[PDB]
Symmetry: C2
Subunit: 169 residues, 2 copies
């Protein structure tokens, strides 16, 4: 291979209101507003169809990005997929940070589920003001040791068995 | 604030076939398979409803994650939102890496759009085997200088004007 992925540059979703979204992510998660692009038409088309594209700081140079499309029909969803599948999780340093976040969100009126033990990490869950599913998580102190038990042979075997049976291997 | 977001921990989407997805991301983008969770029922429910949750290495500890839900109705989409809105972009080091990636993808039969100049970064676009919109990008050498021209006052003003008019400020 002549190239390697460095990191996630940005992950983009639709939002209902750019200013309300910027304000919420700053207030609830201290995520700073980096920049915005905006145009009154979609590239290569003439028709009036404005958008605002916003970048938010998600840490270590990662960006959480939104588009507001004020002349498009209201955002919907993939009705064939459960809500818990599509989500974004952000890492916090440790349990003290996760509990701090949980308390802060609750004090600001956000319903928070958790803490949930996923073995290699521990998480809390809440919705953003656009209905996106968010997760905050910290890695278990023994996470790398538990992951390292998965050998390349086990990975191959698990995928093959799953491909054959579509039951948990 | 008593906590800070460190980075994106994982971003999750649905995939149609776990093994084909793992194989494609390794072949096309050299993204390694880290681990998988699988169960035959969704937590807290009894009914047969298996899933496989896979983590792929997206660089610097970021994870691109997928779920395969083999007993659910086929994946769909939000029909009220254009395809170009929801997407994920991964960073490459520089133009040589982006052109290497473009050539590699094309040699493996992937249609690639680009290179597109976005001023602060340069990008190529292609679909994954699940219909997700992918982007590879490298940052312009003067990107930080161009972004630094946006003062906190300009950000406030742009959001206020946009909130009022819903036209590009
Ligand atoms: Zn998760
Ligand atoms: Zn993009």
């Amino acid at each position: 291979m002549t190239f390697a992925i460095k990191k996630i540059h940005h992950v983009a979703y639709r939002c209902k209101d750019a200013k309300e979204t910027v304000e919420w992510y700053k207030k609830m998660l201290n995520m700073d507003f980096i920049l915005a692009f905006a145009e009154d038409h979609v590239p290569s088309t003439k028709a009036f169809d404005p958008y605002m594209h916003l970048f938010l700081d998600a840490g270590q140079g990662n960006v959480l990005a939104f588009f507001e499309l004020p002349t498009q029909p209201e955002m919907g969803r993939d009705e064939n997929t459960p809500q818990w599948v599509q989500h974004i999780a952000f890492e916090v340093e440790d349990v003290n940070a996760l509990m701090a976040a949980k308390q802060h969100l609750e004090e600001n009126g956000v319903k928070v589920l958790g803490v949930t033990n996923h073995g290699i990490f521990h998480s809390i869950y809440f919705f953003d003001p656009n209905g996106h599913r968010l997760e905050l998580t910290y890695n278990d102190v023994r996470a790398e040791e538990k992951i390292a038990k998965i050998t390349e042979e086990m990975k191959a075997e698990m995928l093959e068995e799953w491909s054959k049976t579509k039951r948990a291997p």
